[PDB]
Design a protein around this nucleic acid. Sequence first.
DNA 1: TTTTTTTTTTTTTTTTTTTTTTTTTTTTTTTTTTTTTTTTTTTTTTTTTTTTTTTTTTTTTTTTTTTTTTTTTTTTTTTTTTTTTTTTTTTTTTTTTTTTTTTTTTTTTTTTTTTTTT
Length: 49
Amino acid sequence: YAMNVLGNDWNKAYKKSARVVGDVIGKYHPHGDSAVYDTIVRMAQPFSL
DNA sequence: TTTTTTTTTTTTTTTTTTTTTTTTTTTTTTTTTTTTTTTTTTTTTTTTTTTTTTTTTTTTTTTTTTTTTTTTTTTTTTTTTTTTTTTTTTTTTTTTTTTTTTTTTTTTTTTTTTTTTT
């Protein structure tokens, strides 16, 4: 939801992971960074999903 | 106004314990030295027809010493018991998976101050 609200569309240019993690932690997820980034890393990598 | 009782932290330095620097013994690790395997070719060894004079088996008969034989008494064999080892259920502990809670370190760059050595 944070990546959709930011506008991280698949055909648009990339955005840094720090901005997305900061936006998620600031707005939606109250559980602090370094665990949202692990979920993002797992969702990105092709041998896990 | 002078004088009298009591209380504790310090002059403490010494005894006990703890912490921190040390170096003998069995378990790793790199080296040299000896067991394995594949090619060349090479004189050398070795596979297969022909002839040949040989020397051991099969007609026949003989005996004697190993094959018959019965029996006493041993002694290896088997029985029970118990110990030692092997092997497998049982239990315990530890590790990895993915979202969470927490933290912790090493260096550049300059300029100024402490803090030891000569």
